[PDB]
């Protein structure tokens, strides 16, 4: 996350850290959201390889055993049938992970609230991106979870030629476009939007400009969660 600040520990209880094994170590690579006790929602580009996964719930400081984490393994990965890794701009960047066991819900570990099917956010809806990703383009990952004010940008603006143009589809949500942005390592994580006083997960971080993470007029692009409610229900 570029800009913003370190979040208060465990203040976004559905945020998860997706890590892969390499030798004796596990490395954080993507974020995600706990949507059911045994199910995680993340980006397809995070799990379209055969890696040994570790899902960490209730996480804050990646390098410390704080006592509130729940370490989980992945039983099965479901990638959207329309996903094409060769063309991230085509959309369908979403995947579900069936965990081997179910989480124990508590103050540090809770389920995300998903939006009604096809719900569209009005322009400038207050939202926050969360994650352990790079703190600047080419910069280091953040040991602690960060958050950054990242209000929604409607499709009309986002798809205008001065912004993302035709790269953004209606099945995507844009947010930011300024100094704050997601960055490498934030992929798969949530775009938490306040609707009617509550936080709902409206997006799954998908991509940013190739020039730089927080490139001017290049808002972070998210898979629009509301467009995939029926697909998810068909799987779970
Ligand atoms: Ca920790």
Swiss-Prot record:
Paired cysteines (S-S): 30-46, 127-193, 158-174, 183-213
CDD domains tied to this protein: Tryp_SPc
Catalytic activity: Hydrolysis of proteins, including elastin. Preferential cleavage: Ala-|-Xaa
Domain Peptidase S1 stretches: 1-236
Domain of life: Eukaryota
Xref: InterPro entries: Peptidase_S1_Elastase_sf, Peptidase_S1_PA, Peptidase_S1_PA_chymotrypsin, Peptidase_S1A, Trypsin_dom, TRYPSIN_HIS, TRYPSIN_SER
Enzyme nomenclature, EC number: 3.4.21.36
Major site of localization recorded for this protein: secreted
Keyword Hydrolase: yes
Obligatory cofactor(s): Ca(2+)
Compartments reported by the entry: Secreted
Active site residues per record: 45 (charge relay system), 93 (charge relay system), 187 (charge relay system)
GO cellular-component term (any): extracellular space
Cofactor note: Binds 1 Ca(2+) ion per subunit.
Record keywords: Calcium, Disulfide bond, Hydrolase, Metal-binding, Protease, Secreted, Serine protease
Family: Belongs to the peptidase S1 family. Elastase subfamily.
Function: Acts upon elastin.
Name of protein: Elastase-1
Organism from which the protein derives: Salmo salar
């Amino acid at each position: 996350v570029v800009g913003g600040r370190v979040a208060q520990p465990n203040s976004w209880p559905w945020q998860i850290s997706l890590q892969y094994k390499s030798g004796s170590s596990y490395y954080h690579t993507c974020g995600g959201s706990l949507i059911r006790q045994g199910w995680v929602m993340t980006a397809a580009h995070c799990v379209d390889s055969a890696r040994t996964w570790r899902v960490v719930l209730g996480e804050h400081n990646l390098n410390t055993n704080e006592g509130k984490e729940q370490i989980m393994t992945v039983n099965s990965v479901f990638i959207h049938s329309g996903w094409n890794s060769d063309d991230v701009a085509g959309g369908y960047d979403i995947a579900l992970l069936r965990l081997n066991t179910q989480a124990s819900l508590n103050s540090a570990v809770q389920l995300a609230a998903l939006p009604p099917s096809n719900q569209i956010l009005p322009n400038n809806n207050p939202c926050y991106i969360t994650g352990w990703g790079k703190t600047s383009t080419g910069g280091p990952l953040s040991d602690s979870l960060k958050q950054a004010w990242l209000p929604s940008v409607d499709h009309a603006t986002c798809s205008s030629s001065g912004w993302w143009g035709s790269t953004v589809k209606t099945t995507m949500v844009c947010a930011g476009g300024g100094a704050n942005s997601g960055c490498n390592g934030d992929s798969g994580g949530p775009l938490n939007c306040q609707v009617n006083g509550s936080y709902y997960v409206h997006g799954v971080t998908s991509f940013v400009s190739s020039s730089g993470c927080n490139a001017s007029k290049k808002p972070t692009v998210f898979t629009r969660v509301s467009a995939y409610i029926s697909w998810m229900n068909g799987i779970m």
